[PDB]
Design a protein around this nucleic acid. Sequence first.
RNA 1: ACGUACGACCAUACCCAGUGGAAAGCACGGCAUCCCGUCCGCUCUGCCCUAGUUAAGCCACUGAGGGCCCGGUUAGUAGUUGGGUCGGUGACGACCAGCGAAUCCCGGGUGUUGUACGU
RNA 2: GGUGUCCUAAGGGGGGCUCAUGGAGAACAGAAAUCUCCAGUAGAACAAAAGGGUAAAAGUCCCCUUGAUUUUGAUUUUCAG
Lengths: 129, 286, 188, 266, 169
Amino acid sequence: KVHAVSRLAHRIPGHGQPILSCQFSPVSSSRLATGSGDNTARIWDTDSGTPKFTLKGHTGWVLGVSWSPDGKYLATCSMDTTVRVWDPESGKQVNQEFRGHAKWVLALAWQPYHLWRDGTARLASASKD
Amino acid sequence: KLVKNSAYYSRFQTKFKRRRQGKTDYYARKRLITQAKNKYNAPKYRLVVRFTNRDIITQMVTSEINGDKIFAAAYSHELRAYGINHGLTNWAAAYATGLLLARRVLAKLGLDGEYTLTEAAETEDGERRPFKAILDVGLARTSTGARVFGVMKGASDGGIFIPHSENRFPGYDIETEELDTEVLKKYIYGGHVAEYMETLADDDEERYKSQFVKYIEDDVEADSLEELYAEAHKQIRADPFRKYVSDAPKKSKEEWKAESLKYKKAKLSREERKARVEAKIKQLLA
Amino acid sequence: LPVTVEKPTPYTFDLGLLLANDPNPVNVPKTTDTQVLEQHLASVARDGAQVLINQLLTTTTITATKDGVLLTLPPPTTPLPREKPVPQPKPETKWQAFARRRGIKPKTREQRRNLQYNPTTGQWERKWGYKGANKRGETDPIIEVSAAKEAMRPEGTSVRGDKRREIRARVKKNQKQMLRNQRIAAEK
Amino acid sequence: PRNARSKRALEKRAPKIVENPKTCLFLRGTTCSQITQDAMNDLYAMRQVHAKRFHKKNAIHPFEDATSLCFFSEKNDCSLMVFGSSNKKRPHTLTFVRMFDYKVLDMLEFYLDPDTYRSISQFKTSKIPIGMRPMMVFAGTAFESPVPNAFTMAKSMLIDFFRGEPSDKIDVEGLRFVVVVTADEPQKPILRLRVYGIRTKRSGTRLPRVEVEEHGPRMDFRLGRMREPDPAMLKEAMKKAKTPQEERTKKNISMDLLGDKIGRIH
Amino acid sequence: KAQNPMRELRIQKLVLNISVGESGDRLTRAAKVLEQLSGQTPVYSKARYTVRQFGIRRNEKIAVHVTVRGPKAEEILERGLKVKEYELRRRNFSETGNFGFGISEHIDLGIKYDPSIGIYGMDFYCCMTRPGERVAKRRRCKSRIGASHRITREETIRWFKQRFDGIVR
RNA sequence: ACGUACGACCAUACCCAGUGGAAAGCACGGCAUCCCGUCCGCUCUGCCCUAGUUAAGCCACUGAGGGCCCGGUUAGUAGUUGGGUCGGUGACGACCAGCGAAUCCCGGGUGUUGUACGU
RNA sequence: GGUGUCCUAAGGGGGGCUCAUGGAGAACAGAAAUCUCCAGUAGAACAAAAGGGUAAAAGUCCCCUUGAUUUUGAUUUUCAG
C-alpha cells in the first residue's frame, strides 16, 4: 500500500535555471535525476536531501532524463541535438555524445530490458527533425 | 551587620531543585509542554537532545503528571554497532543518532486484542499520519552549525515530522538567505573533520597525531569517512534495533546491587548517635 | 464480550463537557472488603466509560484530518455559573450624548488616519506624534517672528517651544474632560 | 495601565462574552494535616495548567469571614479555591469555594476519609498527560434531587473543577481517562471520587470493548457545611451571553447554502 | 592531596584599568595606549552615578580597560613587575587570593614616548585560579567552587615569591 | 543499590565545614581548521575521548549553629456569635450551645519518588 | 508644574546576562570616579498599591521588524436622503 504524500521532505537547490525533467531511479527512491535549463543534469540523494553528481557537457537545455530499466545508465537529451549516456554511480559520461540529429531532441525511450540483444542496450530518441 | 541571619533564613524561598542544579529551564518547559495552538486534547511529543563530553543523548518524551515518559531513546555510543567508533560527539554522529532514534520510533510504532480509537473510528477517506514531535534543546545555544540541529536533521530524514526552519544549518548564509547544501552534505558525512585531518597532516603533524591518535591506530583515514557514515546510515535504516555489547564489566542486576552495597556507607542509628553525643559530652567534661 | 449495557434508566449525556449522567443507584455492597468494593466501583466506571465511548463514536461527526481523527462536539448544555458578569454598555459620555443629539456621525478609519500629504514639500507626513505636523517648524533653521510677539513674549521663553506649549494646553484640557467623564461614570 | 503589559493583564482580567477557563487557587489554613495536603496535591496535579498554589499559612476561617478569600481572588484572578484545614471536630477538610465577580458565590465542605485515601503515587500505572481533560461520569441517585442540595452543588463544583478548556473538537486519542463520582441518596451518604484509565479491545463489532484500570487518587468524602448563593447573585451568575457568531433569527429571513440572504413571501 | 596537579595555581586573567575621569581626547589616547600594550580593542566604562565634586555625569564614559588572558597576561605582568622591581606589599594581596598594583607612567614598561599621546598611569589586577574554574562559569550546571579548592592570601604570596622571585613587605 | 538523561513533589532538599567514593557514567580536561561568538575560544560554538585527575562539580556520610518539615499538648481553652434559656427592670452573671486560635512545652526528622538506558 | 534641549517612535518577538548593598584588594583615587573577587530572595529596577508581582525575568543590554492603526464577514450593536 502506498500512502499519500502530505508534507515537504526536502527542498534542494542547486540548479540555476528551471527544472525541465525529473525521474526517480527504478531501483529505489534514494536516487533522483533532474535535468534543467542550465545545461546540466543532476543526481540527488533523496535520503538526506543532498546533491550527488552534476552531469555537464550539454550546451543546450536538458529536455530529458531517463534511467535505463536496470538502473545502470542515465540518458539525457538536450537542445544541442545530442544525447549523452552517463554512469550514475560515478557521475561520469559513458563514451562520447550521440550525434546525428539535426534539431532539438525532445524525448527518450529505452528498449525494455528483456529485449536487449547483441550484448548491448538500445535507446530511441525523438527529435524536431 | 550579618546579612545571613535567622530572619534571612526564614524568609528565604528556594528555587526548584533542577533549577538549583542548573539542569532545567522551567520558563521554556512550561511553554513547551503546557501550551498549544489547538485544544483537541491530543498527546504531544518532544525530542530531547542533550550532550555530554563523550556522548549524545536523544530521547522521545511525553509529559505526565508524576514525571516524564521516554517513548524511545538512542545514544551515540550505540553507533559502534553500525561501525562508527571514533568522533562520537561530532555533528555527523549527532546526525546518525537522530536517524537511529527516528527509525526506532517508527519501528516501535510499526510504521517502518487491544487497538487504538483512531483505528476504531477511522473512515474511508483517511490516510496515515506522520509522527510529530517538537525539538527540546535545553540550555544549549541555538547558533548556526550547532549539533542539536544535526540531531533534528537526522531524525527528520529518518521520518519524524519536526517543525523547523533551515536557517540554522551549517552552510546557511544570512545575507543571501540561501543554504549551501554542499556544506550541509560535507557536515552530514563528516567532511569537516576529514578536512581538518588533511590540514593537520599537512601543517602540524604532532597535533595531528595527538588529536587523531585513535583514528591512526584504527587506520581510519580522512577519505574513508564519507563511505563509513553512508554505510552506517544504511545499516541503521536496515536494522534499527541491533544489539551492541560494551567492553565494560558485565554482571547481573542483583550482582550490581551487592557490589554497590559493599561500598555504601550506612546511616548511623539513634543509639550510635546518642552514644557519640555522650562520648563528646564526656570528652568536653574531661 | 458485549459493548452494550442494560440498566433500568437510560444514561443522559452532555458531550460538550464529555459528561455522562447515570441516574440508576450504585448498589454499593455493605461489606468491609476493599477488593470487592473497588471491583464494584470499577464495574460502574467501566459501564459509564463504555456508554460514553459508544455515544461519542456513534452520534458525533468524525473527520479525518492531518491532525488526526477528530470528533465534532456539540456546545455544552450543562448550566454552569460564570466567573464575571456579562459585559454591559459603558455610560454615555458628554461627547457621545452631544453627538447622538446632534446627529454627528463617527469618522471613518480612512478619514482619521495619521497621514497627510504636504504639497510644498511633496511628501507624506503624520498629523501628530513623532515628527508630526502639529510641531511643524520647531526644528527648521530660520523662523520669522513678529516684533509684537517678541515684545509680548516673556523673558527666557523662545519661539521654538510655543507649539509644545499649545499642545500641552490642549492635552491638559482633554485630560480634564476625560477625568470629569470618568468621575461622572463612576458616580453612575 | 500606562505600560502595555499591564494593559494586556487588565484586558485579560476584563469581563468577556466568552469567558476564560476558570483558575483555581490552592491554599491552606494555619493547621492542615498531611492527608489534606496530599489531597490538595492530587487535585492540583489533576488541574495543573489552570491552578495557582499558595505556600504559606493563612489565618482564615471561611465560614466566619471570607474577605481574605475575596481579596485573594481579586489579586490572583482565581474564580475557584480549594482550601485545606483541620480541627478536632473536622480532621481533614477540603473547602471548595466558587466565586462570582470577586465575591463569594457558594461554598461547600468536604470531609476526607483518612483510612481509605490513596494517592496517585500508590497506583503503579501510566498517568494522565499534563493539560489533558478527562471525561466525567456522575453516578447514583444523589444528584437527581428536585430541590437543590449539597450533592447537586458538589456535582456542579466537581464539573466546574474538571471541565478543563472547552473545545468544539476532540481527538479520539484524547479519550483515555475518566473521573467517576458516585453517590446515593439515603447515615450520612458518602461521595466517592475515583479516576481510571481506559483501554480498548476488539469485540467483533465496530464499537470497542472498554476496560478500566485505576489511575488514582482514591477519595471518600462526606458533605459538610454549605454556603448557598444569594438568589439575585445566582441569577446574574447563571445569565448566559450570546456570542456575535450566534445570529439573531429574523422572521422570513434566512441564509441559503450559497450564503445569499433569502426572503420568504406568502 | 595538596600535591594533586589539578590544584596548581595559575593566572586566570589580568585586567588593565585607566580611570581618566574625563571623556574625549584623553580617553581616546588612553584607549590607544591600551591598544598598543595589549593588541586588542579596549572597553569604555560608563559612569554609574553623577558626582558634582568629581565633575562626572551618569552614562558618561570616564574610564577604559582591557582583560588579557593567556601568556600575554604573563608577559604583561612580568613587564609591570620589572617596573615595580618585583617588590609588593602585603596589603596588595586580597583575602580571596587575587592581587594587583599600579604604575604612574606607561613609558617605562617599554613603550616609546609619543607627544601626541602623552603620559598615563595604570592599575594592573591579576586574578588567580586553579583548574576546574569552569564549574562556576559554564552555563549548564553552574555551581560553587569547594572551600578547599579556594586560593588564600598566603598561598598566592607563596606562589608569587617562588614564581617571580619577588619580595613582599 | 550506584550512575546518567528527562522529570514530579519544590529547604525533611536551604546556608557553612570535614571525610570517603569499587565499576561505569558524569565532570574537570586537551586543541581552535571548519560552523559560530567575545575587549579576552572567560562564556558560547566546533574538533579530540587519547593523556592526566578525583583537586573541585556530583554523590554518600558526619558535624555545629540557624532554618525548615511532621505529631501531640495548649484545648474544645482564650476569643466571637446567639435573653439563645435561666435569673437580673435592663445592662449583664452563670448555664446551654455553635464556631473556634495562637504562644509556651514535649517528641521525631533533615529527602522521598516516576520513566528510559547502563554499571 | 515652568522653562531650555535630544531622539531610525513606541510596541512586539527572540537571545545573552544579573541587581541594590557589604567585605577584601588596585597610580592619581582621597566617605563619594573606574576595575577585580567573594557574599548577596531581590532589600535594585519596572509595574501596581498583597495579606505570596517579576530572577537563565515582567529587570537590563544586543538582533529583527517598525508597515503611525490591515483584509474579509450573509454575524453583534448603533447609524445611514
